[PDB]
């Protein structure tokens, strides 16, 4: 094991959004809010 000092951690351990956007049309193929990954 090793210890390192880092600038940025991104941790999806709380509710989050995902959005799938088409470049040309801005059509939203898909969108989700994950409030509970287990349900």
């Amino acid at each position: 094991i090793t210890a390192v000092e880092t600038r940025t951690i991104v941790r999806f351990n709380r509710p989050f959004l995902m959005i799938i956007v088409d470049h040309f049309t801005w059509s939203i193929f898909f969108m989700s809010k994950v409030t509970n990954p287990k349900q």
Binding site: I9, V10, R11, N13, F16, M18, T25, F30, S32, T35
Partner: protein
């Protein structure tokens, strides 16, 4: 007109999202705006007068700025790009109409459905409800590679027509998570409760990144093979409502414009599979699509008569996130009984 079309699309998706969250706060939300609007646009080919203008205004199109031909041409051109398989990236979309056996349809509707939506057409014996269900569910199951098997739960013997859309997406991450880095970790539902989930992780990687101090959220884009990507938005704890209050094309554009390639020490993302299914009647009514659900429904561009209305709009979506990539599928069904 392309910018007016783009504004409509985002507005529809976020208007829909806000209504879904309102109906079920704190629940998962999983849906495909394009699957829904494609089915409704397909339906509107056969709609007239108020029934037609309500549908297209409910999809947020402005008929003083974009014509019906321009709208349908937009769907046609988009749909022509959604059936490709390359470099571990799979995109599939199908549209179909399941029509009562021996029920005749207007030539312009069947021609238009084929030309603009690539619609397939099946004769269906709706009096045998079990067999008609299996037919439609099998069409969607095949199209979504087994992911959506029960789109149709109930089917009325008096059904005249069912319009169906499905979309299927499967990709590999450009930089996959190594499963030796997946560990059981806490996922905080809120201040009062957490849940244990398998947490994937990547170390020392450069990805598009933006920290929005005003919305208290972190935005990253994870890239798939085949030049696909996903925008992930991570609100600070108890700041989801703030981000949701700001969802708009302007905010989305600001996010994309603010992304920078940033070296990230660690990235944690849960491995998970969730699904939701919806009856969209209430929400579509809220969005202003009213006449199509009533006896006033003018769907006479389909059958030649005003003998058809929408009884139910159902939607199911599935999201699978795993070390190698992601799978997303959705399907929409519009059930139409005799009137």
């Amino acid at each position: 007109v392309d910018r007016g079309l783009a504004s409509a699309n985002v507005d529809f998706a976020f208007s829909l999202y806000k209504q879904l969250v309102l109906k079920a706060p704190d629940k998962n939300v999983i849906f495909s705006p394009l699957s829904i609007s494609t089915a409704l646009a397909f339906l509107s080919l056969g709609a007239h007068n108020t029934t037609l203008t309500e549908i297209l205004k409910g999809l947020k199109f402005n008929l003083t700025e974009t014509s019906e031909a321009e709208i349908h041409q937009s769907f046609q051109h988009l749909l022509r790009t959604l059936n490709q398989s390359s470099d571990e990236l799979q995109l599939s979309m199908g549209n179909a109409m399941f029509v009562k056996e021996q029920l005749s349809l207007l030539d312009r509707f069947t021609e238009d459905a084929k030309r603009l939506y690539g619609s397939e057409a099946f004769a269906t014996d709706f009096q045998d409800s079990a067999a008609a269900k299996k037919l439609i569910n099998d069409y969607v199951k095949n199209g979504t590679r087994g992911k959506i098997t029960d789109l149709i739960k109930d089917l009325d013997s008096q059904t005249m027509m069912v319009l169906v859309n499905y979309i299927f997406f499967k990709a590999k991450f450009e930089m996959p998570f190594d499963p030796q880095d997946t560990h059981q970790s806490r996922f905080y539902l809120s201040k009062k409760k957490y849940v244990m989930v398998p947490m994937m992780s990547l170390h020392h990687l450069t990805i598009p990144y933006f920290r929005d101090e005003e919305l208290s959220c972190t935005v990253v884009q994870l890239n798939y093979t085949g030049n696909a990507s996903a925008l992930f938005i991570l609100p600070d704890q108890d700041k989801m409502e703030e981000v949701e209050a700001m969802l708009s094309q302007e905010t989305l554009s600001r996010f994309f414009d603010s992304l920078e390639f940033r070296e990230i020490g660690e990235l944690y993302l849960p491995k998970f599979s969730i699904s939701r299914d919806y009856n969209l009647n209430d929400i579509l009514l809220q969005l202003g699509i009213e006449e199509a659900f009533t006896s006033k429904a003018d769907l006479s561009g389909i059958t030649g008569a005003r003998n058809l209305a929408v009884s139910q709009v159902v939607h199911k979506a599935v999201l699978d996130v795993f070390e190698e990539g992601t799978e997303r599928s959705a399907a929409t069904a519009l059930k139409g009984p005799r009137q």
